[PDB]
């Protein structure tokens, strides 16, 4: 085993720690909130607030980054890059999760890992200067994951329903990226078996979804009406929201596949959200 170091242990950091420390790791998780101390205990790590004292890599063999950017880039680099690229040769693995929003928009086409990046927006473009100030960073066993739209226990859409206030935005043509956390969790796991010193992986389910499907199903599961549709050139969407509408892409997720031996135990979003709704692993 060895000592994973979680900068932002958030949502999918967790999953993975609860599955990683009763196999003997050690998991060291940061948060910058106070009140999420609690909560990253329970996930099997020691919790430390950052900013606040620097975190200390004495011992660790893992790196794992779940802190989104800015429009300087990568956070962890800013304040302990100089530490990191030192320490490169101690870890065994680094990995960096980053975002399907890199590529920008493909009108529907399909894209991989080779693809070239061309985001439309600033989110997606801080998340490509993150990644290549992580790739810059010599002789670092680093590792990039492009998560879809996660999902999950406690992050699903059946809390979402019941109380109004829900609508189905069209925008013909348009899909969605999705993963499910288990999923992520098997990828990070499957990586840190299988080290490749500067690889990136999509990590995504096989099935591009209109969002207004998955809406739609989980409305169709709860035995609730189809909740209305709006189009979306009427739907009078602040930015933000509308900025999601602005690329639409499909992305391969063979490598993690052949490369990493990784097996979907969510493979769509229909065996997802059944799954979901019974709180049940199948």
């Given at each position: 085993t060895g000592t994973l170091l979680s900068f932002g242990h958030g949502y999918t950091a967790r999953v993975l720690s609860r599955a990683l420390a009763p196999q003997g790791w050690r998991i060291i998780g940061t948060s910058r909130?106070?009140?999420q101390m609690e909560a990253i205990r329970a996930s099997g790590a020691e919790p430390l607030l950052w900013p606040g004292e620097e975190p200390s890599?004495?011992?660790?063999t893992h790196l794992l980054i779940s802190t989104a950017p800015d429009s300087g880039g990568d956070p962890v680099l800013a304040a302990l890059g100089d530490q990191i690229a030192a320490r490169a040769?101690?870890?065994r693995w680094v990995g960096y999760l980053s975002t399907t929003?890199?590529?920008?928009?493909?009108?529907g086409a399909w894209v991989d890992e080779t693809t070239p990046l061309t985001p439309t927006a600033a989110r997606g473009r801080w998340r490509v200067m993150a990644e290549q100030q992580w790739q810059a960073v010599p002789n670092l066993p680093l590792h990039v994951f492009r998560l879809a739209g996660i999902y999950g226990p406690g992050r699903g859409p059946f809390s979402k329903l019941?109380?109004?206030?829900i609508r189905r935005i069209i925008k013909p043509g348009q899909v969605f990226s999705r993963i499910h956390v288990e999923d992520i969790a098997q990828v990070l796991a499957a990586s840190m078996a299988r080290p490749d010193p500067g690889a990136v992986y999509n990590v995504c389910d096989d099935e591009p979804v209109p969002p207004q499907d998955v809406i739609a199903y989980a409305a169709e599961l709860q035995g609730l009406p189809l909740p209305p549709a709006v189009d979306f050139d009427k739907a009078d969407l602040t930015p933000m929201a509308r900025s999601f509408y602005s690329e639409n892409k499909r992305v391969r997720n063979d490598r993690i596949k052949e490369e990493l031996g990784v097996r979907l135990k969510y493979p769509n979003y229909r065996v997802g959200l059944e799954a979901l709704q019974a709180d049940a692993e199948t």
């Open positions: 909130n106070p009140d890599l004495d011992g660790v040769a101690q870890f929003a890199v590529y920008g928009d493909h009108d019941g109380k109004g206030g």
